[PDB]
Design a protein around this ligand. Structure first.
Ligand code: VZW
Ligand code: ZN
Length: 258
């Protein structure tokens, strides 16, 4: 009886195995745009992905991860609210069964069709497993997806999903450039939070871009043909793999922009 996103094992159940689910800095949250304060002290955000080395794509039973070589400082996130250097390790998405839901963060209670998470870890902790034990261990760059025009830079991901339909399947996924997944603007909101899946560790600086990217109905339909289940098991479509907004508690969401 493992965690997941079903009636019997979904977000409302997680606290039983992972009591930090009811903690002081859980993610995601609703971003109240009228309450978030511009912070003139926020340094410029630096997304350096020119030397990114993608390796593999994995269906982990919850989402799919595009994994990167993080054995040296190739693709890094710096600046913004961050101190030091954060190495890209993987990206994944959360998405809905329909276009009116799927994002984890919400904007004035608005749900997007999906949300991309580019996950990075603080190199002062030496490895990802040590970083997740620290309050400043991870930086996740979150990008909203809306349904409209196709995102050309997403199509190589959409076209490999057939090959990783079920839990535990992977495929070679070299030479993928994550710069093709960014919006024009790097305006963002930031707040201290957590992993949005078990074990829900409170180790994440969240950086959520204001500008969504557009993907096509056909692109997000291919996400929804994935499976939570393993090969040969009854089909359970991989949809609605999102955690709802959590209480903000004693936190301020800061804006990079006026
Ligand atoms: N939606 S999201 O919020 O962006 C997001 C959600 C999940 C993930 C993710 O990929 N995971 C979550 C962390 N999880 C963990 C890994 C851990 C440890 C603890 C861990 F929770 C340890 O304490 C530990 C130790 O040294 O003792 C070692 N490891 C590593 C070596 C395997 C690895 C998988 C990323 C982003
Ligand atoms: Zn995520």
């Amino acid at each position: 009886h493992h965690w997941g996103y079903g009636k019997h094992n979904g977000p409302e159940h997680w606290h039983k195995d992972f009591p930090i689910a009811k903690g002081e800095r859980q993610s995601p949250v609703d971003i109240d745009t009228h309450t978030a304060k511009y912070d003139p002290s926020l340094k410029p955000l630096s997304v350096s992905y020119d030397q990114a080395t993608s390796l593999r794509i994995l269906n982990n039973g919850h989402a799919f991860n595009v994994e990167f070589d993080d054995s040296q400082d190739k693709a890094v996130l710096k600046g913004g609210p961050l101190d030091g250097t954060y190495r890209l390790i993987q990206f994944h998405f959360h998405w809905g069964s329909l276009d009116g839901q799927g994002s984890e963060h919400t904007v004035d209670k608005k749900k997007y069709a999906a949300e991309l998470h580019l996950v990075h870890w603080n190199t002062k902790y030496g490895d990802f497993g040590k970083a997740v034990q620290q309050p400043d261990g991870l930086a996740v760059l979150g990008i909203f997806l809306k349904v409209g025009s196709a995102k050309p830079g997403l199509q190589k991901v959409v076209d490999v999903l057939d090959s990783i339909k079920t839990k535990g399947k992977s495929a070679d996924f070299t030479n993928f450039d994550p710069r093709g997944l960014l919006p024009e603007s790097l305006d963002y909101w930031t707040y201290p939070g957590s992993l949005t899946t078990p074990p829900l560790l409170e180790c994440v600086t969240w950086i959520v871009l204001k500008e969504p990217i557009s993907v096509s109905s056909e692109q997000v339909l291919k996400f929804r043909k994935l499976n939570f289940n393993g090969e040969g098991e009854p089909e359970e479509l991989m949809v609605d793999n999102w955690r709802p907004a959590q209480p903000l508690k004693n936190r301020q969401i800061k804006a990079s922009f006026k």
